[PDB]
Amino acid sequence: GLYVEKVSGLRKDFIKGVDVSSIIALEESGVAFYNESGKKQDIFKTLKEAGVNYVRVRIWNDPYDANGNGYGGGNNDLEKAIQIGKRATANGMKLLADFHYSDFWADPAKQKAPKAWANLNFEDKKTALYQYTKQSLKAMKAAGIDIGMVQVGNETNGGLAGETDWAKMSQLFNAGSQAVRETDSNILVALHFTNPETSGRYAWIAETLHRHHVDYDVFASSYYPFWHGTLKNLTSVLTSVADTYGKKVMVAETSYTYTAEDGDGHGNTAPKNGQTLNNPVTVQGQANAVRDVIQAVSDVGEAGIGVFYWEPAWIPVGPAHRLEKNKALWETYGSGWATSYAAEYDPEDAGKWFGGSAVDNQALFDFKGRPLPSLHVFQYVDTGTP
């Protein structure tokens, strides 16, 4: 019964991606995924069949404490990035390596230097970042992974690898870019920012990137309708960057709630009083939201290259009523957004909120691993529903 209005002007090579970085921790936690028919199947195969043509994976330098206890949130390191990349290429999908350049979650409020770079002077940290990127990419190439793009940083609105001065951040951006350029000329270099609704922000950032000669191809943006303003604004601010600086643009992260229920007992990020919810919290609502961001980015014209849905399969390791049993799994496999072992690195946030999935209700799969009708949105935006 799913309905999808055809996206007008959508290019045939539009990037349709998903970030399923938590897939490895989940599978080790016992979680399983299925396909339409209902038979266990590799999620990457189901994604390919759904029309997805790109996979994004977050990479933390060393997301573990001194003893090796994972910080959680998927315990995403280079090693899991290779596992995911291999399965992505094996299923005909390009890879987007997303380097946070930190040992844990990197966002507007958190851009902590990796423990190894904790006390390196700026010069040495820069070359370490360049080196890390270079070696990581080479390990992926060696694994035969088809890399189509690299994100030098994740939501670096106010910092990167412990740095907050934009003159220094730019040098770090170039150190990362350098590595990518040396690895493969065909790999697109992306920079990722968020909060597009903030007046003049993206215009200021783009101009600053230009004044510091940062070498990049894609100006990426997060876009969560709950807090980031209108689609009209998104298109407007991305088009401005595109036309003024000749860059490509895209949405590196987006999602929507298909249900108000919490599937694993650990409070979800959305929905919540105060959040802007222009679509009904249903499977159709979710599908309309995705379809609309795709339209919004496509409306940018030449420069709008794609949209990545963030974590469409971070489903529960168990029902909400088995909360205590779930905690054990989140703790042991880091299949939750964070573990108590991350308190040493991030006492402020992870330190007091560690637990399970905060987005199980925004997946494109149900709590049991079955694909929701909304997964079809990737195929239907080209033609629309029959």
Ligand SMILES: OC[C@H]1O[C@@H](O[C@@H]2[C@H](O)[C@@H](O)[C@H](O[C@@H]3[C@H](O)[C@@H](O)[C@H](O)O[C@@H]3CO)O[C@@H]2CO)[C@H](O)[C@@H](O)[C@H]1O
């Ligand atoms: O569980 C209900 C509560 O969740 C809190 O959110 C927690 C952290 O405060 C939040 O930073 C974290 O977000 C993770 C990561 O830091 C972020 O960059 C990324 O985009 O999402 C991650 C989670 O998917 O999530 C935890 C979850 O407990 C809310 O702050 C609190 O109000 C309440 O909703």
Ligand SMILES: OC[C@H]1O[C@@H](O[C@@H]2[C@H](O)[C@@H](O)[C@H](O)O[C@@H]2CO)[C@H](O)[C@@H](O)[C@H]1O
């Ligand atoms: O990780 C969650 C989420 O954070 C958003 O940014 C919030 C807030 O909305 C901003 O106004 C604030 O400046 O920074 C915080 C981060 O703590 C960000 O815009 C989203 O894309 C997500 O990263």
Ligand SMILES: [Ca+2]
């Ligand atoms: Ca939950």
